[PDB]
mmCIF file of C-alpha atoms in Angstrom:
data_model
loop_
_atom_site.group_PDB
_atom_site.id
_atom_site.type_symbol
_atom_site.label_atom_id
_atom_site.label_comp_id
_atom_site.label_asym_id
_atom_site.label_seq_id
_atom_site.Cartn_x
_atom_site.Cartn_y
_atom_site.Cartn_z
ATOM 1 C CA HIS O 1 -118.795 16.956 -75.388
ATOM 2 C CA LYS O 2 -118.103 13.797 -73.400
ATOM 3 C CA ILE O 3 -115.312 14.040 -70.817
ATOM 4 C CA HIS O 4 -114.082 10.989 -68.906
ATOM 5 C CA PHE O 5 -112.349 10.947 -65.522
ATOM 6 C CA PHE O 6 -110.256 8.106 -64.103
ATOM 7 C CA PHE O 7 -108.920 7.712 -60.562
ATOM 8 C CA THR O 8 -106.096 5.191 -60.139
ATOM 9 C CA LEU O 9 -105.223 4.579 -56.491
ATOM 10 C CA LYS O 10 -102.095 3.296 -54.798
ATOM 11 C CA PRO O 11 -102.602 -0.322 -53.662
ATOM 12 C CA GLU O 12 -101.551 0.403 -50.076
ATOM 13 C CA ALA O 13 -100.481 3.319 -47.887
ATOM 14 C CA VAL O 14 -96.795 2.836 -47.047
ATOM 15 C CA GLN O 15 -95.507 4.587 -43.885
ATOM 16 C CA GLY O 16 -98.470 6.949 -44.156
ATOM 17 C CA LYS O 17 -97.876 7.820 -47.819
ATOM 18 C CA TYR O 18 -100.743 7.669 -50.321
ATOM 19 C CA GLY O 19 -101.727 9.057 -53.694
ATOM 20 C CA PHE O 20 -103.868 8.793 -56.790
ATOM 21 C CA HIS O 21 -103.852 9.932 -60.408
ATOM 22 C CA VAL O 22 -106.447 11.782 -62.471
ATOM 23 C CA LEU O 23 -106.445 11.075 -66.208
ATOM 24 C CA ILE O 24 -108.333 13.038 -68.862
ATOM 25 C CA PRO O 25 -107.258 11.500 -72.190
ATOM 26 C CA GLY O 26 -109.759 12.933 -74.668
ATOM 27 C CA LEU O 27 -109.414 16.531 -73.526
ATOM 28 C CA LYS O 28 -106.506 18.242 -75.285
ATOM 29 C CA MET O 29 -104.811 21.549 -74.461
ATOM 30 C CA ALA O 30 -101.383 23.181 -74.368
ATOM 31 C CA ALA O 31 -98.751 22.986 -71.642
ATOM 32 C CA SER O 32 -99.440 26.565 -70.543
ATOM 33 C CA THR O 33 -103.122 25.736 -70.090
ATOM 34 C CA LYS O 34 -102.197 22.737 -67.941
ATOM 35 C CA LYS O 35 -99.868 24.902 -65.849
ATOM 36 C CA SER O 36 -102.597 27.499 -65.323
ATOM 37 C CA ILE O 37 -105.130 24.823 -64.367
ATOM 38 C CA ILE O 38 -102.688 23.199 -61.938
ATOM 39 C CA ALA O 39 -101.968 26.582 -60.363
ATOM 40 C CA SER O 40 -105.724 27.049 -59.975
ATOM 41 C CA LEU O 41 -106.324 23.675 -58.288
ATOM 42 C CA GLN O 42 -103.788 24.434 -55.544
ATOM 43 C CA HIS O 43 -106.086 27.162 -54.163
ATOM 44 C CA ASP O 44 -109.358 25.206 -54.254
ATOM 45 C CA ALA O 45 -111.001 25.423 -50.833
ATOM 46 C CA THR O 46 -113.536 22.704 -51.669
ATOM 47 C CA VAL O 47 -110.825 20.114 -52.337
ATOM 48 C CA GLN O 48 -109.015 21.094 -49.141
ATOM 49 C CA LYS O 49 -112.086 20.739 -46.922
ATOM 50 C CA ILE O 50 -112.735 17.407 -48.626
ATOM 51 C CA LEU O 51 -109.192 16.310 -47.763
ATOM 52 C CA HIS O 52 -109.078 17.519 -44.145
ATOM 53 C CA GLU O 53 -111.354 14.772 -42.810
ATOM 54 C CA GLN O 54 -109.400 12.249 -44.912
ATOM 55 C CA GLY O 55 -106.345 12.612 -42.665
ATOM 56 C CA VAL O 56 -104.401 14.846 -45.059
ATOM 57 C CA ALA O 57 -101.630 16.736 -43.273
ATOM 58 C CA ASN O 58 -100.990 19.315 -46.034
ATOM 59 C CA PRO O 59 -103.623 19.511 -48.790
ATOM 60 C CA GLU O 60 -101.877 22.519 -50.362
ATOM 61 C CA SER O 61 -98.709 20.584 -51.257
ATOM 62 C CA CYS O 62 -100.661 17.491 -52.321
ATOM 63 C CA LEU O 63 -100.849 18.586 -55.964
ATOM 64 C CA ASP O 64 -97.611 18.327 -57.928
ATOM 65 C CA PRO O 65 -97.148 21.233 -60.375
ATOM 66 C CA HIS O 66 -94.767 19.103 -62.464
ATOM 67 C CA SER O 67 -97.737 17.067 -63.727
ATOM 68 C CA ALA O 68 -97.579 19.078 -66.967
ATOM 69 C CA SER O 69 -93.898 18.225 -67.543
ATOM 70 C CA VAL O 70 -93.266 14.629 -66.426
ATOM 71 C CA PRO O 71 -93.959 11.972 -69.082
ATOM 72 C CA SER O 72 -96.816 9.805 -67.881
ATOM 73 C CA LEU O 73 -96.787 6.123 -66.975
ATOM 74 C CA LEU O 74 -98.713 3.878 -69.303
ATOM 75 C CA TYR O 75 -101.488 2.080 -67.462
ATOM 76 C CA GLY O 76 -100.316 -1.074 -65.718
ATOM 77 C CA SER O 77 -96.684 0.022 -65.647
ATOM 78 C CA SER O 78 -95.007 1.042 -62.410
ATOM 79 C CA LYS O 79 -91.864 2.490 -60.881
ATOM 80 C CA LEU O 80 -89.055 0.223 -59.702
ATOM 81 C CA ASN O 81 -89.975 -1.600 -56.478
ATOM 82 C CA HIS O 82 -93.383 0.094 -56.620
ATOM 83 C CA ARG O 83 -96.714 -1.569 -57.244
ATOM 84 C CA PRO O 84 -98.806 -0.381 -60.211
ATOM 85 C CA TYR O 85 -101.558 2.119 -59.544
ATOM 86 C CA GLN O 86 -104.842 0.205 -59.417
ATOM 87 C CA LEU O 87 -107.837 1.808 -61.098
ATOM 88 C CA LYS O 88 -110.515 2.569 -58.507
ATOM 89 C CA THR O 89 -113.341 3.818 -60.728
ATOM 90 C CA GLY O 90 -113.920 5.907 -63.821
ATOM 91 C CA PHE O 91 -116.500 8.650 -64.339
ATOM 92 C CA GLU O 92 -117.993 10.045 -67.540
ATOM 93 C CA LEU O 93 -119.187 13.637 -67.903
ATOM 94 C CA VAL O 94 -121.348 15.331 -70.539
ATOM 95 C CA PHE O 95 -120.826 19.054 -71.094
ATOM 96 C CA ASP O 96 -122.911 21.276 -73.368
ATOM 97 C CA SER O 97 -122.517 24.942 -74.272
ATOM 98 C CA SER O 98 -126.255 25.655 -74.013
ATOM 99 C CA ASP O 99 -126.539 24.792 -70.298
ATOM 100 C CA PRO O 100 -123.210 25.545 -68.593
ATOM 101 C CA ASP O 101 -124.745 25.181 -65.117
ATOM 102 C CA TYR O 102 -125.861 21.551 -65.590
ATOM 103 C CA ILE O 103 -123.005 19.172 -64.773
ATOM 104 C CA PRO O 104 -123.917 15.458 -64.834
ATOM 105 C CA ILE O 105 -121.512 12.878 -63.410
ATOM 106 C CA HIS O 106 -121.910 9.115 -63.779
ATOM 107 C CA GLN O 107 -119.751 6.029 -63.385
ATOM 108 C CA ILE O 108 -118.605 4.274 -66.546
ATOM 109 C CA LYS O 109 -120.158 0.842 -67.043
ATOM 110 C CA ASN O 110 -118.457 -2.302 -68.369
ATOM 111 C CA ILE O 111 -115.068 -0.735 -67.686
ATOM 112 C CA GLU O 112 -113.495 -4.165 -67.112
ATOM 113 C CA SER O 113 -114.485 -5.260 -70.639
ATOM 114 C CA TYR O 114 -112.472 -2.500 -72.338
ATOM 115 C CA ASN O 115 -108.870 -1.979 -73.398
ATOM 116 C CA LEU O 116 -107.833 0.078 -70.382
ATOM 117 C CA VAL O 117 -104.282 0.871 -71.497
ATOM 118 C CA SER O 118 -105.525 2.026 -74.905
ATOM 119 C CA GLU O 119 -108.289 4.246 -73.526
ATOM 120 C CA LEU O 120 -106.244 5.758 -70.700
ATOM 121 C CA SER O 121 -103.361 6.768 -72.981
ATOM 122 C CA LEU O 122 -102.962 10.541 -72.987
ATOM 123 C CA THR O 123 -101.757 10.805 -76.588
ATOM 124 C CA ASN O 124 -104.060 8.102 -77.977
ATOM 125 C CA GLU O 125 -106.533 9.161 -80.665
ATOM 126 C CA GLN O 126 -108.258 5.876 -81.613
ATOM 127 C CA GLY O 127 -109.873 5.065 -78.276
ATOM 128 C CA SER O 128 -113.200 3.315 -78.713
ATOM 129 C CA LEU O 129 -114.602 5.007 -75.595
ATOM 130 C CA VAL O 130 -112.440 8.060 -74.925
ATOM 131 C CA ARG O 131 -112.790 10.443 -77.853
ATOM 132 C CA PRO O 132 -110.485 13.379 -78.607
ATOM 133 C CA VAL O 133 -111.996 16.791 -77.842
ATOM 134 C CA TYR O 134 -109.841 19.299 -79.738
ATOM 135 C CA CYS O 135 -109.656 22.487 -77.681
ATOM 136 C CA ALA O 136 -107.961 25.801 -78.466
ATOM 137 C CA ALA O 137 -104.351 25.500 -79.648
ATOM 138 C CA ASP O 138 -102.515 27.927 -77.367
ATOM 139 C CA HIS B 1 -130.850 16.118 -47.383
ATOM 140 C CA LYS B 2 -131.889 13.322 -49.736
ATOM 141 C CA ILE B 3 -134.654 13.854 -52.307
ATOM 142 C CA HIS B 4 -136.209 11.040 -54.346
ATOM 143 C CA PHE B 5 -137.846 11.381 -57.767
ATOM 144 C CA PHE B 6 -140.087 8.802 -59.435
ATOM 145 C CA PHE B 7 -141.398 8.736 -63.008
ATOM 146 C CA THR B 8 -144.357 6.456 -63.774
ATOM 147 C CA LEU B 9 -145.030 6.429 -67.513
ATOM 148 C CA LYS B 10 -148.189 5.574 -69.405
ATOM 149 C CA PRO B 11 -147.764 2.153 -71.057
ATOM 150 C CA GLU B 12 -148.743 3.461 -74.501
ATOM 151 C CA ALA B 13 -149.959 6.510 -76.412
ATOM 152 C CA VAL B 14 -153.544 6.662 -77.694
ATOM 153 C CA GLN B 15 -154.423 9.042 -80.555
ATOM 154 C CA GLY B 16 -151.331 11.097 -79.770
ATOM 155 C CA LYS B 17 -152.013 11.314 -76.026
ATOM 156 C CA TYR B 18 -149.296 10.591 -73.463
ATOM 157 C CA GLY B 19 -148.809 11.177 -69.764
ATOM 158 C CA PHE B 20 -146.688 10.455 -66.726
ATOM 159 C CA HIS B 21 -146.329 11.332 -63.057
ATOM 160 C CA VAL B 22 -143.501 12.882 -61.049
ATOM 161 C CA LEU B 23 -143.726 11.975 -57.368
ATOM 162 C CA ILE B 24 -141.823 13.568 -54.488
ATOM 163 C CA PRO B 25 -142.952 11.836 -51.265
ATOM 164 C CA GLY B 26 -139.890 13.021 -49.336
ATOM 165 C CA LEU B 27 -140.659 16.715 -49.731
ATOM 166 C CA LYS B 28 -143.152 18.144 -47.185
ATOM 167 C CA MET B 29 -144.347 21.732 -47.825
ATOM 168 C CA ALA B 30 -147.641 23.620 -47.760
ATOM 169 C CA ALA B 31 -150.327 23.415 -50.429
ATOM 170 C CA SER B 32 -149.836 27.110 -51.198
ATOM 171 C CA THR B 33 -146.150 26.367 -51.765
ATOM 172 C CA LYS B 34 -147.111 23.563 -54.149
ATOM 173 C CA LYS B 35 -149.416 25.901 -56.070
ATOM 174 C CA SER B 36 -146.621 28.475 -56.297
ATOM 175 C CA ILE B 37 -144.212 25.814 -57.560
ATOM 176 C CA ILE B 38 -146.690 24.592 -60.178
ATOM 177 C CA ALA B 39 -147.220 28.186 -61.294
ATOM 178 C CA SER B 40 -143.446 28.551 -61.613
ATOM 179 C CA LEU B 41 -143.052 25.432 -63.772
ATOM 180 C CA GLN B 42 -145.856 26.380 -66.168
ATOM 181 C CA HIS B 43 -143.620 29.138 -67.595
ATOM 182 C CA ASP B 44 -140.324 27.210 -67.614
ATOM 183 C CA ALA B 45 -138.993 27.594 -71.148
ATOM 184 C CA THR B 46 -136.370 24.881 -70.624
ATOM 185 C CA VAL B 47 -138.922 22.117 -70.042
ATOM 186 C CA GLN B 48 -140.971 23.467 -72.947
ATOM 187 C CA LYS B 49 -138.015 23.273 -75.335
ATOM 188 C CA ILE B 50 -137.186 19.837 -73.924
ATOM 189 C CA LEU B 51 -140.642 18.667 -74.965
ATOM 190 C CA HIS B 52 -140.316 20.660 -78.204
ATOM 191 C CA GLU B 53 -138.170 17.979 -79.852
ATOM 192 C CA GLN B 54 -140.273 15.190 -78.306
ATOM 193 C CA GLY B 55 -143.153 15.826 -80.708
ATOM 194 C CA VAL B 56 -145.091 17.737 -78.043
ATOM 195 C CA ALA B 57 -147.569 20.343 -79.274
ATOM 196 C CA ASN B 58 -148.128 22.582 -76.221
ATOM 197 C CA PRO B 59 -145.619 21.997 -73.408
ATOM 198 C CA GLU B 60 -147.003 25.069 -71.618
ATOM 199 C CA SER B 61 -150.341 23.296 -71.066
ATOM 200 C CA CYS B 62 -148.914 19.965 -69.902
ATOM 201 C CA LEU B 63 -148.793 20.871 -66.203
ATOM 202 C CA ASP B 64 -152.036 20.533 -64.264
ATOM 203 C CA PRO B 65 -152.453 23.396 -61.761
ATOM 204 C CA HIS B 66 -154.757 21.182 -59.672
ATOM 205 C CA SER B 67 -152.075 18.561 -58.961
ATOM 206 C CA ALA B 68 -151.686 19.932 -55.424
ATOM 207 C CA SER B 69 -155.401 19.463 -54.650
ATOM 208 C CA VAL B 70 -156.690 16.392 -56.519
ATOM 209 C CA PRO B 71 -156.237 13.176 -54.488
ATOM 210 C CA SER B 72 -153.386 11.090 -55.856
ATOM 211 C CA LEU B 73 -153.580 7.517 -57.122
ATOM 212 C CA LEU B 74 -151.708 5.045 -54.971
ATOM 213 C CA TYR B 75 -149.059 3.125 -56.867
ATOM 214 C CA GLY B 76 -150.480 0.194 -58.799
ATOM 215 C CA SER B 77 -153.965 1.690 -58.910
ATOM 216 C CA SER B 78 -155.509 3.153 -62.043
ATOM 217 C CA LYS B 79 -158.481 4.905 -63.585
ATOM 218 C CA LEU B 80 -161.470 2.965 -64.883
ATOM 219 C CA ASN B 81 -160.778 1.455 -68.314
ATOM 220 C CA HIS B 82 -157.187 2.694 -68.017
ATOM 221 C CA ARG B 83 -153.977 0.758 -67.547
ATOM 222 C CA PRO B 84 -151.951 1.767 -64.470
ATOM 223 C CA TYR B 85 -148.875 3.917 -64.938
ATOM 224 C CA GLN B 86 -145.730 1.787 -65.173
ATOM 225 C CA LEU B 87 -142.683 2.926 -63.224
ATOM 226 C CA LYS B 88 -139.894 3.578 -65.718
ATOM 227 C CA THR B 89 -137.060 5.184 -63.739
ATOM 228 C CA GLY B 90 -136.363 6.058 -60.130
ATOM 229 C CA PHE B 91 -134.044 8.876 -59.074
ATOM 230 C CA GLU B 92 -132.500 9.994 -55.800
ATOM 231 C CA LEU B 93 -130.912 13.407 -55.270
ATOM 232 C CA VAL B 94 -128.527 14.680 -52.592
ATOM 233 C CA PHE B 95 -128.946 18.263 -51.394
ATOM 234 C CA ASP B 96 -126.290 20.061 -49.356
ATOM 235 C CA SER B 97 -126.923 23.633 -48.245
ATOM 236 C CA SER B 98 -123.184 24.331 -47.977
ATOM 237 C CA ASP B 99 -122.807 23.980 -51.771
ATOM 238 C CA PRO B 100 -126.182 24.794 -53.363
ATOM 239 C CA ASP B 101 -124.700 24.747 -56.885
ATOM 240 C CA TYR B 102 -123.580 21.093 -56.675
ATOM 241 C CA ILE B 103 -126.535 18.879 -57.601
ATOM 242 C CA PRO B 104 -125.748 15.140 -57.674
ATOM 243 C CA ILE B 105 -128.348 13.077 -59.519
ATOM 244 C CA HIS B 106 -128.177 9.281 -59.464
ATOM 245 C CA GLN B 107 -130.702 6.604 -60.327
ATOM 246 C CA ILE B 108 -131.772 4.375 -57.451
ATOM 247 C CA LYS B 109 -130.443 0.824 -57.615
ATOM 248 C CA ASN B 110 -132.624 -2.280 -57.266
ATOM 249 C CA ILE B 111 -135.915 -0.419 -56.923
ATOM 250 C CA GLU B 112 -137.637 -3.713 -57.781
ATOM 251 C CA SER B 113 -136.543 -5.123 -54.400
ATOM 252 C CA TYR B 114 -138.484 -2.527 -52.379
ATOM 253 C CA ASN B 115 -142.134 -1.973 -51.516
ATOM 254 C CA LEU B 116 -142.884 0.590 -54.211
ATOM 255 C CA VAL B 117 -146.429 1.283 -53.011
ATOM 256 C CA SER B 118 -145.206 1.859 -49.456
ATOM 257 C CA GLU B 119 -142.292 4.094 -50.451
ATOM 258 C CA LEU B 120 -144.022 6.162 -53.138
ATOM 259 C CA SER B 121 -146.801 7.169 -50.719
ATOM 260 C CA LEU B 122 -147.044 10.957 -50.552
ATOM 261 C CA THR B 123 -148.390 10.948 -46.992
ATOM 262 C CA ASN B 124 -146.230 8.201 -45.477
ATOM 263 C CA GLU B 125 -143.448 9.260 -43.111
ATOM 264 C CA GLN B 126 -141.759 5.895 -42.409
ATOM 265 C CA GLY B 127 -140.324 5.214 -45.854
ATOM 266 C CA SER B 128 -137.326 2.904 -45.775
ATOM 267 C CA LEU B 129 -135.716 4.800 -48.666
ATOM 268 C CA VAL B 130 -137.795 7.978 -48.898
ATOM 269 C CA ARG B 131 -136.993 9.969 -45.780
ATOM 270 C CA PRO B 132 -139.401 12.623 -44.476
ATOM 271 C CA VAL B 133 -137.778 15.994 -45.173
ATOM 272 C CA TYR B 134 -139.858 18.550 -43.255
ATOM 273 C CA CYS B 135 -139.889 21.832 -45.173
#
């Protein structure tokens, strides 16, 4: 399977407030699976030690558990009086069942020549790049 | 630590014969260690099955046990009546002992802008890109 990762960053840090989004359009699961995954990520030591040198005051509260409930912004849209999240870079990942311990990560090329809003849509199923990976229907 | 990998491929295959080189100038170990490593690879079933779908007859016999003893061709050189191996891809790897299970692999960018003969030297210790990792 091919899994794509996108990191859209806030244009500027206002009064010491920052953030970014992680989008996985092709991968498909249930709400309970997303809740379990989000609960797992809150206790990841690796992420925390990554964040400590970044100036993060509280890495534990950085992840919002409501990410499985809130409807998601389309790409390019934004909140009132808030700038749109600018895409920093996008990574592609290839996962195989034969070799679970081999995890390749590479940047996506020619990203600027592609329909970003179409590909980044969570419910989209006709993305030319992002393809739907049907997982278990919980 | 940073580890660099280089893959110089034979320009063409004669009578079903192919070959290439894997060079690790950054690594610095003993010859006995190199022999042990070569012995380890000769029984690696993963590489054998990788070559299995390549049209390769005997992947077990592809490794030369003498590679740690025979003097190595400098880059650009060749054997008599033999075209020199052409560099196809160049890889760099980042090793961190804190997380041994995280292995980032990325191709090197703009290798054509660097002194390939100087960098790919197995005995050189002043490589601009290849850094001497004493092991």
